[PDB]
Design a protein that fits this description.
Chain C: Belongs to the CYFIP family. Chain C: This is Cytoplasmic FMR1-interacting protein 1. Chain C: It is found in: Cytoplasm; Cytoplasm, Perinuclear region; Cell projection, Lamellipodium; Cell projection, Ruffle. Chain B: It is found in: Cell projection, Filopodium; Cell projection, Lamellipodium; Cytoplasm, Cytoskeleton. This is part of a larger assembly, with three copies of chain A, one copy of chain B, one copy of chain C and one copy of chain E. Chain A starts with a helix and ends in an 11-residue tail after the last helix. In chain A, helix 2 runs antiparallel to helix 3. The longest helix of chain A is centred in the last third of the chain and has 13 residues. By secondary structure, chain A is mainly alpha-helical. Chain B is low in regular secondary structure. Chain B is built from no helices and two strands. Chain C is mainly alpha-helical. Chain C is about 55% helix and about 0% strand. Chain C has 20 helices and three strands. In chain C, helix 6 packs antiparallel against helix 10. By secondary structure, chain E is an all-alpha fold. Helix content of chain E is about 75%, strand content about 0%. The chains are: A mainly alpha, B little secondary structure, C mainly alpha, E mainly alpha.
């Protein structure tokens, strides 16, 4: 899915990658879970699986 | 911006296949009348009797 | 370089090799640190410091030289196949650069397998090639290619084609009126052949004008096909971008549950997937601005109700300014009937001459030119606003009508009648469809009554 | 039917001049009325259960 | 076209 | 004229024995038909009734013989004569309509031609319709080209309706310039005129002179019923005996008045003249024949170009309703609406069937390009018919299936897209919307059916093989836009976006749900049995070399290319649903593990 979306919507994928990468891990899990869910919706390799 | 120079608006709209009228035509009762020969007197140069 | 050393049909092979290179880069990036595949691709294509890369320039070069004057269109299959006899070989492409198998697909066996896989697309151009071209050219390549095609069409119409039309007009009969039905199909055919005998003997008509007409038809067909491919690509992209733009499908509604409540619940369930609002809630000012711009770019596409063939048609019509196309004003003050001062009569003469069944040792019009000639002629007629006049006034159509009315078959001057009328039937079927399509894309004078004397 | 018969009698006693090429409307109306009367009577005769 | 000159 | 002659000479049979012109006219009338029409559906046999009536008369044996000869001649030649008339009229109307469309301004000077053509076509159509159902001598009574004639009559009607103002201007200018002066100078040349007739002519001249072209373009509505009624009153006054101003000696005056009345009718009665000349409400009471003709028109690709004529004809149904019997109105309107809806639905069904056939042909052509067909070439080189040939046209006299389907589709689409919309009994109708709805439904069904899912054998089509077919279908559907003004991008959005959800709007399984079920019940389940293993080298599941061979290869469904195609087909929604199902399975596994942990 990540490979497929990498060339179909490059702007949104790049924005999601930039947002997830530079998210402070010190933040509580409440917002980190939402960030990880949004990233995984595009197929990004999140360390913690929100679905699990 | 450079590709928009050759673009025009397509005319596209969607309706509902059959569109009904605001008010539906209602039946009119049939009223028997005698043969009247004095109904065209007001049309043109008519004669009376 | 390998792509530049082959014809346009190698675009699929180039795309496959680029995909292989991207896969290799992705595999290597796990341990090593290389630039993004886009940066390397653009540096190799020289698109980083130039508006147009090598791929688009080569595509334009091929379109100008080898594609248009060698491929004949086929509307039934929507495919392009090379001409039975080439009328152009001065392309003089570069020399194929040799390299180790590693720089290629990876090995001799892999190279052979990929060559065999991609060898099926060598002898035709179709939807796959068009979509690959669209993907590789983005929007800049399409824009520049269409601009150059418009320039080429302007040069051709006002150049060789104009001179040939002017030369052919002089030899055309001064006055030609459709004969009556009493004469019969054979006499009418003989009369038409005698009137247009000089046109038939002319040799350059089937080698230069026809060729030029084929070149102008293939260009417009390529323009139309490229647009459709672009639209399809845009629709696929839009379908993919729905979850991140709060776009949802019509959810199933059952008795007891209202559509509005179900839609609201579904939107609430997918609320986290939304990007813009999420970014605004937890994002830097710069990130938010960038996200908004990206979203705007993503949601606006040409497929959202923007047409592009109409502008091309209008420009082609504007390119027609010579008075020879329309001729002088009618003597009767309504329209030309007998005089042949209009281009539609010349097109009818062309149809009559190339509708004659040729021998067995020579090629036909379709084999060499296909439908490009007919498409170009119909486009010219439509842009000149003479489609109705051409339909009403036509030698082939009148001959076919008379033949149907009387039903006779004779060998009039080594020309079978039934076969000729069947060919005319097929050609007018094609022309009617082409004219209808052209009219669907593009979309008074009051007279005085007689006065008493 | 009674009114049509009365009108036809009036026309006959009037000794009218008929010519489709001169007075188109009059002749057209007269012939149309006669044909309508004839067809109406034939249709009435056709209906089986009027009696 | 002129882009043809440029590519040449 | 036929009914006039026949019935009048039957009533006045006395003159038939004396006059010679009357006998010839009656014989010609009899020879030109075999059955009249008392009313819409009623018919009346002529020769048999005439023979029965004349048998009882004293010396009418010659009339019986003439009736028999006329019957023979009619039954021999009427069908052929009418067939030739229709054949000529088809081309005549085609040429006239095309010329008028090219030069709309010609309607004014050549208005009479349009009405003559419409009247002739209507007469032929009604004759054929009434003679097909009755008089089964039995063929020349079945015509496959009536649709073209009806379409050209509708084209002429639309041309008249749209270009009314130009005709109005031309004819008002004519009346104000030529007819007014001619009548004014002719009236003064009358020996004597009574008071009423003088007032009538003065009113005529004053009205005609008061007309100006300026009133046409500002929306002014004319009304000349009074003028026609006054002319008819003048005719009645001057057509009787013992009249000072007899019309028998002033035939030219009558001709001029008739011409002026025609001009006035054109100026102010365009719609009434159109109804009088080209009303085809008779088809309403010949529903069986109408449906048969429509079906015969549809099955001919050449004649399918004029399929829109029948729904257009349905608009004429309410032109046969009288004010003395409003009962018919509702039933006639309902029948017309039902017929129009059925015709449009049949046209849409035919269009979608042709499009499905073309899509199947395109998919068959495309599947040949898949890599699996190039194995033989690789093997021949290592161990040492093609695409594009089918698109070569040696000659145009050979017809394949693709070209025939394309031609039929083009003709049907042109027929559908003839008019943006229409009104029937005050009810607006759009044919393109019907076509779009049918296409969407068909596309969804086709997408679901190409998966080749088999619950019994747990067989499913590979994502790539289905993605290629979906792309071919999308390309074919996009090709439709060249012929019709429908929007296909949003059609793809609607049809394809619903396939991503676990259940479509209509409530049927989608491709994503079927793929998830197959993957969870056939691929991953078999892995736990040891028959399949995860090969990280190939990044896909590969069947083990066990003695037992499964019915499918995991490498042909879990490969990157196959996974990429599946993701493209499904979308983020489908991937999220699959992940949720996998997490449900993992949660069940963890719950089971917790029992062993706690014990």
């Amino acid at each position: 899915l990540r490979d497929v979306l990498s060339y179909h919507i490059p702007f949104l994928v790049s924005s999601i990658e930039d947002f997830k990468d530079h998210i402070p891990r010190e933040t509580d899990m409440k917002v980190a879970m939402n960030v990880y869910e949004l990233s995984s919706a595009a197929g990004l390799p999140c360390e913690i699986d929100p679905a699990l | 911006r450079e590709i928009g120079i050759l673009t025009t608006n397509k005319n596209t709209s969607r309706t509902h296949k059959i569109i009904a009228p605001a008010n539906l035509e209602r039946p009119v009762r049939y009223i028997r009348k005698p043969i009247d020969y004095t109904i065209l007197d007001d049309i043109g140069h008519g004669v009376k009797v | 370089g390998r792509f530049e050393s082959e014809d346009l049909t190698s675009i699929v092979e180039l795309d496959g090799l680029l995909e292989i290179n991207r896969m290799t880069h992705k595999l290597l990036s796990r341990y090593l640190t290389l630039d993004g595949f886009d940066a390397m691709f653009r540096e190799a294509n020289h698109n980083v410091s130039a508006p147009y890369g090598r791929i688009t320039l080569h595509v334009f070069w091929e379109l100008n030289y080898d594609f248009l004057p060698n491929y004949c269109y086929n509307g039934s299959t929507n495919r392009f196949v090379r001409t039975v006899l080439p009328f152009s070989q001065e392309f003089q492409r570069d020399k194929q650069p040799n390299a180790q198998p590693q720089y290629l697909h990876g090995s001799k066996a892999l190279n052979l397998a990929y060559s065999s896989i991609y060898g099926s697309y060598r002898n035709f151009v179709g939807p796959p090639h068009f979509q690959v071209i669209c993907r590789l050219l983005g929007y800049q390549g399409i824009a520049v290619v269409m601009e150059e095609l418009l320039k080429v069409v302007k040069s051709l119409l006002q150049g060789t084609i104009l001179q040939y039309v002017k030369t052919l007009m002089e030899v055309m009969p001064k006055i030609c009126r459709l004969p009556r039905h009493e004469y019969g199909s054979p006499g009418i055919l003989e009369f038409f052949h005698h009137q247009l005998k000089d046109i038939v003997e002319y040799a350059e008509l089937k080698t230069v004008c026809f060729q030029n007409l084929r070149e102008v038809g293939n260009a417009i067909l390529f323009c139309l096909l490229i647009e459709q491919s672009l639209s399809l690509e845009e629709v696929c992209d839009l379908l993919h971008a729905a979850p991140f733009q709060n776009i949802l499908p019509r959810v199933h509604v059952k008795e007891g549950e209202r559509l509005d409540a179900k839609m609201k619940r579904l939107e609430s369930k997918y609320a986290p997937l939304h990007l813009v609002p999420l970014i605004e809630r937890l994002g830097t000012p710069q990130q938010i601005a960038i996200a908004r711009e990206g979203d705007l770019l993503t949601k606006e596409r040409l497929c959202c109700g923007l047409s592009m063939f109409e502008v091309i048609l209008t420009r082609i019509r504007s390119f027609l300014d010579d008075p020879i196309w329309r001729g002088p004003l009618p003597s009767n003050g309504v329209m030309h009937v007998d005089e042949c001062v209009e281009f539609h009569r010349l097109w009818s003469a062309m149809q009559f001459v190339y509708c004659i069944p040729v021998g067995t040792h020579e090629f036909t019009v379709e084999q060499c030119f296909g439908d490009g000639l007919h498409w170009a002629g119909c486009m010219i007629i439509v842009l000149l606003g003479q489609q109705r006049r051409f339909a009403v006034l036509d030698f082939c159509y009148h001959l076919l009508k008379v033949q149907k009315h009387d039903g006779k078959d004779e060998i009039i001057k080594n020309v079978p009648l039934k076969k000729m009328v069947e060919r005319i039937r097929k050609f007018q079927i094609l022309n009617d469809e082409i004219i209808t399509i052209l009219d669907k894309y593009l979309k008074v004078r009051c007279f005085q009554p007689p006065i008493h004397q | 039917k009674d009114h049509v018969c009365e009108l036809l009698n009036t026309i006959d006693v009037c000794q009218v001049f008929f010519d489709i090429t001169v007075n188109f409307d009059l002749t057209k109306n007269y012939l149309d009325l006669i044909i309508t009367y004839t067809t109406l009577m034939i249709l009435l005769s056709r209906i089986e259960e009027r009696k | 076209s002129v882009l043809l000159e440029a590519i040449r | 004229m036929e009914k006039w002659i026949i019935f009048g000479f039957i009533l006045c049979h006395g003159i038939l024995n004396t006059d010679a012109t009357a006998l010839n006219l009656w014989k010609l009338a009899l020879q030109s038909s075999s059955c009249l029409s008392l009313f819409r559906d009623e018919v009346f046999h002529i020769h048999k009734a005439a023979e029965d009536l004349f048998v009882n008369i004293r010396g009418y044996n010659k009339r019986i013989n003439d009736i028999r000869e006329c019957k023979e001649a009619a039954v021999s030649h009427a069908g052929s004569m009418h067939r030739e008339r229709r054949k000529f009229l088809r081309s005549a109307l085609k040429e006239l309509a095309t010329v008028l469309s090219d030069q709309p301004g010609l309607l004014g000077p050549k208005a009479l031609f349009v009405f003559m053509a419409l009247s002739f076509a209507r007469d032929e159509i009604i004759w054929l319709l009434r003679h097909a159902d009755n008089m089964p001598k039995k063929d020349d009574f079945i015509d496959k080209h009536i649709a073209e004639l009806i379409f050209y009559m509708e084209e002429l009607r639309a041309h008249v309706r749209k270009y009314g103002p130009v005709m109005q201007r031309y004819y008002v200018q004519y009346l104000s310039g030529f007819d007014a002066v001619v009548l004014n100078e002719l009236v003064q040349n009358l020996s004597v005129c009574p008071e009423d007739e003088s007032i009538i002519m003065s009113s005529f001249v004053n009205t005609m002179t008061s007309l100006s072209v300026k009133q046409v373009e500002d929306g002014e509505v004319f009304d000349f019923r009074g003028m026609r009624l006054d002319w008819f009153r003048l005719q009645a006054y001057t057509s009787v005996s013992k009249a000072s101003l007899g019309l028998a000696d002033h035939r030219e005056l009558g001709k001029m008045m008739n011409t002026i009345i025609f001009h006035t009718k054109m100026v102010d009665s365009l719609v009434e003249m159109l109804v009088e000349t080209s009303d085809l409400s008779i088809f309403c009471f010949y529903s069986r024949a109408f449906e048969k003709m429509f079906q015969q028109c549809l099955e001919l690709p050449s004649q399918s170009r004029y399929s829109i004529a029948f729904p257009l004809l349905c608009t004429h149904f309410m032109s046969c309703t009288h004010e003395l019997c409003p009962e018919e109105r509702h039933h006639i309107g309902d029948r017309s609406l039902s017929l129009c809806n059925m015709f449009l639905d049949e046209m849409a069904k035919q269009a979608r069937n042709l499009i499905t056939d073309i899509c199947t042909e395109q998919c068959t052509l495309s599947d040949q390009l898949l890599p699996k067909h190039c194995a033989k070439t690789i093997s021949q080189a290592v161990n040492k018919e093609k695409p594009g040939v089918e698109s070569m046209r040696k000659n145009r006299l050979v017809v394949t299936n693709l070209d025939k389907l394309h031609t039929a589709l083009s003709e049907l689409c042109f027929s559908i897209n003839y008019v943006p919309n229409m009104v029937v009994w005050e009810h607006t109708f759009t044919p393109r919307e019907y076509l779009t709805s049918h296409l969407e439904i068909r596309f969804t069904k086709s997408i679901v059916g190409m998966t080749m899912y088999n619950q019994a054998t747990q067989e499913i089509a590979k994502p790539s093989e289905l993605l290629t077919s979906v792309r071919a279908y999308m390309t074919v559907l996009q090709s439709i836009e060249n012929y019709v003004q429908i929007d296909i991008t949003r059609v793809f959005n609607n049809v394809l976006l619903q396939q991503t959800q676990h259940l479509d709007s209509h409530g049927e399984p989608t491709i994503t749900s079927l793929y998830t079920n197959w993957y969870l019940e056939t691929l991953l389940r078999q892995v736990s049995n040891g028959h399949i293993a995860y090969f990280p080298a190939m990044k896909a599941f590969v069947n083990l070399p066990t003695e037992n061979e499964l019915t499918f290869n995991a490498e042909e469904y879990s490969d990157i290319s196959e996974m990429r195609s599946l993701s493209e087909l499904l979308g983020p929604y489908g991937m999220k649903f699959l992940s949720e199902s996998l997490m449900w399975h993992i949660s069940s596994q963890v719950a089971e593990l917790k029992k062993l942990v706690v014990e």
